[PDB]
Structures are given as structure tokens and as C-alpha cells.
Design a protein around this nucleic acid. Sequence first.
DNA 1: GCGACACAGAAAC
DNA 2: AGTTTCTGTGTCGC
Length: 290
Amino acid sequence: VILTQLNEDGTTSNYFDKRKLKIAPRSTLQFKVGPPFELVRDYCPVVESHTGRTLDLRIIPRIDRGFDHIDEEWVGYKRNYFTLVSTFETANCDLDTFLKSSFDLLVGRLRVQYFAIKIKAKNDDDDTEINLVQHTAKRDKGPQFCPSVCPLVPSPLPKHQTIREASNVRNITKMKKYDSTFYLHRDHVNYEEYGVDSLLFSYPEDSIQKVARYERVQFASSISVKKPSQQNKHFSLHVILGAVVDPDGIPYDELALKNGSKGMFVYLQEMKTPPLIIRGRSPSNYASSQ
DNA sequence: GCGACACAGAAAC
DNA sequence: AGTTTCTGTGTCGC
């Protein structure tokens, strides 16, 4: 009925089938680690400006809500929230040095303005993109939006428990406790330590996230979850690390820059989940029908 | 099958 | 210790 796995930090993931067991909306049992991510590929090389040394990059993603491991499949629910978090790391560069240097794409060298992550959902069988939607905590009483590109600096991925604890914090004191985990405030550094060309100072905003946290995410309400044969569709969640450049034959998405001009999110690395099943609104997907 | 509204119960304070 | 917030899901009606 409930299958329990121990997480890396000592919390548990408790997998249950909502067709058989109804658990309260805010139960800690709704929090669990989802499927592991796998490398899809590496794309454009990045090199430090003078040394010419190649920056080796690694996406560090995890799903902390919305997916259960049920008899050999990973299962989500159309109507319910999932959480996908990600950082990236640079194995061969400490953060403090990284922020002070400058980086080019090796395509022929385009200056990297900043690094960022975006997420996508796909039909895993045909590579078709599927829309994702996010809400605020107010849900229907607030706006819905599509996941945005998240400027980010390299950082360890917080433990599952930390993502849990930070999920619905209002109180100012607790916010302060978690600030340094999720944000770098560029306006608080010593500006004299940095060259005008430094990477830190080509980020678009002073408040820079250390962790991309996509919470209250759902597949669009219009997705069909079954194939015509009534077999389940297979979906997959993708995380892409990119370098944003000023575009004045390699994979990239256009990005609406801060100054207004047309920018380029140039792909560096992409990871994805194994196939995912999503259960629709059918009453037979719920324990209430029994 | 989908948008909207409603109820419920644990978290957050 | 009580109030409000958040989120899984029951339900209506088109």
C-alpha cells in the first residue's frame, strides 16, 4: 500500500497509488523524490576568456513532489502539483572565481552574459513538446503562468527536506533563514572586487537565484494522457542549461532580453526523466470510485 | 473531457 | 491554541 524509500538526506519518499489510497493534501506523504534524470546530451562548449580552459558543467536536478514509483512506472496526476528543482555545478571552478571571470561559447566566440535553466515537457515517444503551467499558492485566486527561464549561478542542490521546508514560508524571519540558500544578492557584494566585464555583472537582475525551483507545476489541462489505442502516453520532463548571449547553426531558443533586444538562449546541456505516465481526471484514477 | 467552484484537513503561524 | 493558508480531489454543468 505504501512503499518507502530512504532519501539521501534521511527523509523518506512514500509511494502510494491514489487509485487505492487517499491521503490529505498537505500530508508530508505528498512530498517524495521523483524519477532520476539522465543526460540527453552536451551541446556548446564554454571556455574562460584568457585561460581558454573548458568549463565542465553538470545539471543537478530533482523532482520533490508529484510523482510516485508504482510497479516499475513513474506516475503523476494531471490535476496535481509537481515540483522540479535544479542547480548546476562547475566541477573545475569555485563560485567566487567563476563570478569574477568571463566566458565565451566555442562555436567564433560569443560572450556569455549569464547562465540559465529552462524546463520542458515532451512526449517521450515522438519528441513533441507539451505545455506546462504554474500557479501561485493562491491557485485560481491568482495568475497562471508558463515556466520561465531562470538565471542561475552554480550551487549545490538543496536536500529534499530543505525544499520541503521552504515550500510555503511567509514569516519574514524564516524567509531570512533560507535567503542565502536560494539567492545571491549582487547589490550586496563589494563592487570594487569585480571588473566591468565580470560574469556576475552581466546577469540581468541584482537578485540572482542559486536554485531554479519550479513549484506548483502541472501539465496543461488540455493534454490527452492516453494514446488512441488506450495505452498510456509516455511523457518526460527535460531540464536544459543554457548560456544567454547577445546575437549581434547550433541549438538555441530565442529569449526576450532585459533591454528589449532579441537574445539567444544557447543550449549547453540537457537532461531528462525516464518515461512518465500521467493519470487524467477519470474517476477510476481515484480511490473514491471504489 | 474541461473550467469552475467547493470542501476538507494538515501545515504555517 | 485558534486562524488562515495551501492543495488533493469531489462535483456540477456545458
